[PDB]
Amino acid sequence: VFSGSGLPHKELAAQIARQATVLDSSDDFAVVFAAIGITFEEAEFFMEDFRQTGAIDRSVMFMNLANDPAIERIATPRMALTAAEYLAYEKGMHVLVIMTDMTNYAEALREISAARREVPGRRGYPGYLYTNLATLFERAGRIRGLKGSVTQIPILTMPEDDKTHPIPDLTGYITEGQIILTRELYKSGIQPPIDVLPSLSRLKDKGTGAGKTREDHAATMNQLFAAYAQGKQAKELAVVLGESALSDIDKIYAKFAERFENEYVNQGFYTNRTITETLDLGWELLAMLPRTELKRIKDDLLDKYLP
Amino acid sequence: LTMPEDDKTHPIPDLTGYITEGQIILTRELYKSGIQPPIDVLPSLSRLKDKGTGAGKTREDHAATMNQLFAAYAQGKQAKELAVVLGESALSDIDKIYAKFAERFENEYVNQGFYTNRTITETLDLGWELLAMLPRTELKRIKDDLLDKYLP
Amino acid sequence: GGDISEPVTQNTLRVVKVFWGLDSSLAQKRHFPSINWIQSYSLYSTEVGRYMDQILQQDWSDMVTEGMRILQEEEQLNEIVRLVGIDSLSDNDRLTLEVAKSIREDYLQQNAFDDVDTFTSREKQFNMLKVILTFGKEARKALSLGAYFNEIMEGTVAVRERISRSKYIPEEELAKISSINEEIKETIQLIVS
Amino acid sequence: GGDISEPVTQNTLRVVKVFWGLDSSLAQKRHFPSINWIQSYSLYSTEVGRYMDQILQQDWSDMVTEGMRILQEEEQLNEIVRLVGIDSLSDNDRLTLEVAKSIREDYLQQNAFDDVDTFTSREKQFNMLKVILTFGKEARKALSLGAYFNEIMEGTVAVRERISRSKYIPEEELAKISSINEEIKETIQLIVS
Amino acid sequence: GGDISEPVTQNTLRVVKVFWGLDSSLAQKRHFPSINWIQSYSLYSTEVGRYMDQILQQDWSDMVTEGMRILQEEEQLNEIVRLVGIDSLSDNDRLTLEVAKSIREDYLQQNAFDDVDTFTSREKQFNMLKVILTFGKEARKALSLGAYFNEIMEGTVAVRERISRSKYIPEEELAKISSINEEIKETIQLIVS
Amino acid sequence: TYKIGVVGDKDSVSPFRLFGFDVQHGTTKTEIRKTIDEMAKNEYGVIYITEQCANLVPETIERYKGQLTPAIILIPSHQGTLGIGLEEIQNSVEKAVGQNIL
Amino acid sequence: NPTRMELTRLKKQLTTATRGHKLLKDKQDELMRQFILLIRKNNELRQAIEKETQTAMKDFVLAKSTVEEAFIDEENVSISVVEKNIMSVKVPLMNFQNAELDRSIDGFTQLLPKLLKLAEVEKTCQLMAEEIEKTRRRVNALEYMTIPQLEETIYYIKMKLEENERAEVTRLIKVKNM
C-alpha cells in the first residue's frame, strides 16, 4: 500500500488484518502483523483494536517502537517473516503478513548505513536498498507440494507523495502490484481513499473467476475500470472547458465516477464486504450505464447479471 | 558579511542570522537602480527594534508609521507588478497611488546618499510626507489619535 | 560550465574591484563583448564618474546611472514578459524596452574585428550615449503629450538608424552624432501633429 | 526556511499529534493568539471530543466540528468575495460569513492581558461556542422562513454585541452567557414578524 | 524513478542501436506494449526500411515514415489542444488526430494475451498499416474537395470501426483486411457527393 | 466616416441603396468570396449579409471576426434565418463561460 | 545547469508565474462576467431585429409582386467609428453621420438605428470573446506548461545539489583516510 503522511493507512491496515479471510477454510488462516518504528500511541491503536475485534486470536504481532534501536527496527520484519514462514510451510497455514511502516524500515537502514561509514546511494539511501528490500518481499509465495502460503502487504508512506522516491520506487520493482492512497480521495472522505487508476495487482487473474469468485469478476473489473477512466476524464474536462464542452454521453460517465467513489470505493473502515456483495454492487453501478456501451462484457454475462 | 552568489541560504549568512538579532540586507537590484544605500527593507529585520522606540527615545509614531510604510511599500510593489501583468487599465486609482508611493519610497526615503546624515526627526517627518500620498482611509494600521497629529 | 559559484571566481571576486561577467546567452546571440551588465560591477564607478564629469564638463554620472537604471528596469520587465507575454505592456514600458534595446544593440555590442568599432574614444562614447538617452527622454515627453508609442516609432525610423550606425562614425566626424540630438527633438515634436 | 518542510519539523510531526501553526500574517491583523486555524491540527480532537461529551453531558464534539466547518467554508467564500464582490452573493453564504466572523472575533481572538479573557474555562468555552452557533441557524430559519438577511442584522445589533462580549463575563456570573441563547430566538422571532 | 539519465541506461545507449523506452503513463492508460513511440528509436530503421521495400516490393519505408510523422504531428497538436481546445483546430489537423488515434489504438496497441493479436505476421502488419494510412489519404484529399471533417467522420463509423478489429483478423483470412481499402475509398466517395 | 455594404437577395436587400448602402450579390461561396474582401479591404465599417449567402462561406465571417472593422452582421431574407446568427452568439457563450447563461 | 545560482533564480520565477497565473485568471473571470451582460444584450437585440428586418422584407415582396418589376429598377450614409475601451479591449462606437411601395421603404428606415446598434454590440461581443481566449491561452500556457516546468526543474536541481554535497563529503572522508 503506497500511502502518505496523514493518510489513513493504519485504519486500512487494521481493517485488512481483521477482515482478511480465506473462503471454505476453518482455522487455517493467520495474520502476522509487523509494526516498524511507529509511535507508542500508534502501536496501542493496533494492539487494542486487534484484541477488541478478537483479531488477536488468529494473529501474531511483532511490535517495534520508534524509540527502539535502529537495528531492532531492521530486524523486525525478519522476525515476522520467520514466524510467518514457520506457520505457513511447517504448519500448513495461509499467512497474511502486514508490515508498516516500510518507510521507517528504510530510514532505520539508512541510519545504520551511515553509522558504518558506508557509501550513500541515491537520495541518501544505501546502494543495497533494492536487494535488502528484496530479501524481505521475496519471502512471500508458495512452494510446490506444500499446504500453506506467505502473502505480504508491505505498507509505506511516499515522502512528498513522490512515487519516484527510492522507497516506493524500489518497492514497486520488487512487489507485484501497488495499492495507492491519494489525498484527493481522503479529502473527499472516501474510506479507504484508494485510487484504482494508478493502483494495480499483477496476479489478480490467479485469484479470480468461477470457483474462486463469481464468473463475472474479470469482465466487470475491466468494465468498471474503463468506465471510471472516462468519467474521471469527463470531470477533468468539465473543470477546464466548462460543463458545456461535455456531450450527453459524457453526462453519465461523470455521474458514474462520482457514485463509484462515494458508494463503491468508499465503504468505511469497518464495513466488511464479501466478494459476492462487492460484485453485486459492481453491476448496480454498471446499470446506470447504457448497455450498448458495455463492450468489455459479453452478452452472456449481461443477460444474466445486469439489472 | 558578503553572501556568496547573493544566496541567503549559504552557511555564512544562514548561521549568522541564527545568532544575531535580525539583519540588514543590500540587494543588487536596488544598487543597479541607483538606490544608495541599497537597503531592501522587506527581507530586512531588527528583532530588538521594539525596545529602542517610542516616546522618550523617539517619537510616539515610530512603531506605528514603520508598520504602515512597510505595508504600503509591499502594496506598492504588488501594484507596480499588476500594471505589467494586466496593464495600465487594471489599476485602481488607489493602486496607482501605491505604485507612485513605492517609487518615491525608493528614490527619496531609502535613497539618501552615503554622506547624508538624517536625524530621526527628519526621517519620521519624511515618512509622514510619503504617507500623505495615500488617502487617510488607507492608513488603518495607525491610531487616529496619532494620525490627526502628524499627518501632512 | 560557466558556474561562477566555483572557488576560483569566488576567491577572485573577494580581492578584485571589477567584475566583467561573461554570459553564454549573450555569446550565443553574438552580443559581444558578452558581458552580463546585470551581474557585472565596478567598485570604481563612483570615482571614475567624478573624473568623467570634470573632464567632459557634462553630467556623465547621471547618464551612466540612468543607462544602468534603464537596463535594470528592462531586466525587471523581461522577467514578467517571459511568462505573461508582450500584450499588456503600457506605452511607457515599451519605450523603456526600446531604449534599453538601443543601449544593448547600439552601444553595448561592439565588434572587435571592425576597423572603426574596435575602439571608441571617450568623447565618442559620451555622444553615442547622449543620443540614445536623448531619444528616450524626448520620446518620453511626447508620450506625456497624448502621442502614441507606435506613432513615435513609425516617425523615428530614419533618426533611429543614425543612432544604430553611430558606432561606425569615424573619430574625426563626431559632429555627425551631436547633430542627431537636434533631429531627435525636431522629428519627435513633428509627430505631435 | 520559515516554512515547515524542514527535516526537524517533519521528524517532529512524525512522533507528535498536535501542531499549532503561529502565523505572522494573523498577528498583523491584530488577531491574537495568531494561530492559523486552517494549517493547525490535533489528532487528539476526536478522543478529547468523547471526553468532553462525557464530562459536559453535551454534544461538544458536534459543535466543534460544525465550528470548524464554518471556518472552512469562510476560506472558500472569501475567495468568491474578492473575485466577484460582497453584494453579489447568497444570503446563506453571507450569514456564514458573519458567523465565521463571530467565531474569529468573539471566540478565537483572546487577550492575554485582560483579567477575564486571559482564561476561559471548559464550561465557559461551551457556553460561548453555543451562543455563536445558536445565532447561526436561528438566523438561518428566518432566512428559510421568508425573512431577509439584512433585516436580521439590525434586529440583532443588541444581542450580537452581547455575544461579542461573552469573553468578558466573569466565571461566577456564567449564566449571563447562556441567557443570550433565549434572547436570540425571541429577537429573531420578532424580526420574522 | 524511470529517469534514463542514470549511468546504466546511458552507458547502454552508447553502444546499442535500439531503444525501446517503456512508459508508465501508457501502462496506466492500458496502452500495451507501453512503448513510447515519440522517445523510442531504432537506428536500424533505414536499413530495415530497404530490406522491407525489397522483400515486400512495396513502399513500406514510406509508409512507416508517414505513420510516424502523423504520430509526432499528433504530439505537437495535443500541446495546442491543451492550450486552446480541440475546437480551434482546422479540419485538416483534426483529421490528423483521428488518423494518429487509429495508429495508436488500432496498430500500436497489441494484447499479448489474445490468440490472434499476440502475433502479427509481416504481411498482415503491412495490410493493417496500409488500411489505416489509406483512410487518412482518402479523407485528406476529400477535405480539399470541400468536404467537412464532421461529415466524413460521422459517415465512416462503420468502416473506421472495421479497421479497429482488423488486428483480430486471422492470418489465413488476410483478404478481409486489404478489402477495406476499396470500402474506405467508396464510402468516402458517397460522402463527397 | 466609412461605408456600409450589403449582401443578400435583391428581393430582400435592394431598398438599402436608397440610403447609399453598397448592395451587392452572390449565390455560391465564391461570389460572397470577393464581395466581402472587396468591402473589407476598402476599409468599410459594417457589412450586413443574409444568412443564406453567409452560410455559403463561413470561411469568411470567422477570418474577419477578431478585427475591429468591418462588422460582419448576419441578417435574414424574406423567409428568414437559418439560425446561424443566434448560435454564433450561442456558441460564443458555451466556450467563454462553460455554461449557458440564457 | 544544476547550479545553486539558477535554483534561487527559478524559485523566484515560480512565485512570479504563480502570481501572474492568479491575476490573469481573475482577469479572465472578470472579462466573462462583463461578457455575460453584453452577450445577453446582443442576444435579444438580434432576436428582435431579425423579426423586424424579415417582416420588412416580406412586405416589400408584396409591394414588389404587383410591379413587373421595371418600376423598382426605378443619401451618402456612413458611420463614424471611434474607439472605446471596455476594460482591456478596444471597442467600436458607431453612429450614423407606389403607395404601399414607400410604405415598405419607410419600412426599411426603422431598421437602420437598431441595425447599427446590433453591429456595434455584436462586434463588441466578438472582440471581448477574443480577449478571453487570448487570456485563457496564457492562463493555460502558464498553469499547464510553464509552472510545472519550473516546479520540478527546481525539484531536480535541489536533489542534484544534495546529490553532489553527499558525493563530495564521501570523497573527502576517503582522502582523509589515505
Curated annotation (Swiss-Prot), chain A:
| Gene Ontology molecular function terms on file | ATP binding; proton-transporting ATP synthase activity, rotational mechanism
Induction trigger: By increasing intracellular Na(+) concentration.
Example GO biological process term?
Answer: proton motive force-driven plasma membrane ATP synthesis
Record carries keyword Transport? yes
- UniProt keyword terms in alphabetical order: Ion transport, Sodium, Sodium transport, Transport
Cystine bridges: none
Q: Which domain of life is it from?
A: Bacteria
Task: State its role.
Answer: Involved in ATP-driven sodium extrusion.
Regarding protein family, the annotation reads: Belongs to the ATPase alpha/beta chains family.
User: Under which name does UniProt file this protein?
Assistant: V-type sodium ATPase subunit B
Q: Which organism is it from?
A: Enterococcus hirae (strain ATCC 9790 / DSM 20160 / JCM 8729 / LMG 6399 / NBRC 3181 / NCIMB 6459 / NCDO 1258 / NCTC 12367 / WDCM 00089 / R)
The organism's lineage is: Bacteria, Bacillati, Bacillota, Bacilli, Lactobacillales
Curated annotation (Swiss-Prot), chains C, D, E:
Report the induction information. By increasing intracellular Na(+) concentration.
* Single GO biological process annotation from the record: proton motive force-driven plasma membrane ATP synthesis
Determine if Translocase is one of this entry's keywords: yes
Gene Ontology cellular-component terms for this entry are:
proton-transporting ATP synthase complex
Lineage, top-rank taxon, reads Bacteria
Which terms are listed as keywords in the entry?
ATP-binding, Ion transport, Nucleotide-binding, Sodium, Sodium transport, Translocase, Transport
GO MF entries: ATP binding; proton-transporting ATP synthase activity, rotational mechanism; proton-transporting ATPase activity, rotational mechanism; sodium-transporting ATPase activity, rotational mechanism
Query: Which family, according to UniProt?
Result: Belongs to the ATPase alpha/beta chains family.
What does it do? Involved in ATP-driven sodium extrusion.
Q: What is this protein called?
A: V-type sodium ATPase catalytic subunit A
- Tell me which species this is from: Enterococcus hirae (strain ATCC 9790 / DSM 20160 / JCM 8729 / LMG 6399 / NBRC 3181 / NCIMB 6459 / NCDO 1258 / NCTC 12367 / WDCM 00089 / R)
Gene from which this protein is expressed: ntpA
Q: Which residues of the full protein are shown?
A: 394 to 586 of 593
Curated annotation (Swiss-Prot), chain F:
An individual GO BP term: sodium ion transport
Molecular function terms from GO: ATP binding; proton-transporting ATP synthase activity, rotational mechanism; proton-transporting ATPase activity, rotational mechanism
Give one Pfam family, short name only.
ATP-synt_F
Q: Which InterPro entries does the record cross-reference, listed alphabetically? A: ATPase_V1-cplx_f_g_su, ATPase_V1-cplx_fsu_bac/arc, ATPase_V1_fsu_sf
Which key words are in the record? Answer: Ion transport, Sodium, Sodium transport, Transport
Family to which the UniProt record says this protein belongs: Belongs to the V-ATPase F subunit family.
> What's the stated role of this polypeptide?
Involved in ATP-driven sodium extrusion.
The name this protein carries in UniProt is V-type sodium ATPase subunit G
Q: Which organism is it from?
A: Enterococcus hirae (strain ATCC 9790 / DSM 20160 / JCM 8729 / LMG 6399 / NBRC 3181 / NCIMB 6459 / NCDO 1258 / NCTC 12367 / WDCM 00089 / R)
Swiss-Prot record, chain G:
Spell out the NCBIfam families in the cross-references: PRK00373.1-2 (NF001543), V_ATPase_subD (TIGR00309)
Pfam families, alphabetically? ATP-synt_D
Protein task: Involved in ATP-driven sodium extrusion.
* Superkingdom, taxonomy of origin: Bacteria
Q: Does the keyword Disulfide bond apply?
A: no
* Family annotation (InterPro entries): V_ATPase_D
Regarding protein family, the annotation reads: Belongs to the V-ATPase D subunit family.
Tell me the Gene3D superfamilies matching this sequence: 1.10.287.3240
Q: Which GO terms describe its biological process?
A: proton motive force-driven plasma membrane ATP synthesis; sodium ion transport
Q: Does the keyword Glycoprotein apply?
A: no
Keyword annotations for this protein, in alphabetical order, are:
Ion transport, Sodium, Sodium transport, Transport
This chain's protein is named V-type sodium ATPase subunit D
Q: Name one GO molecular function term.
A: ATP binding
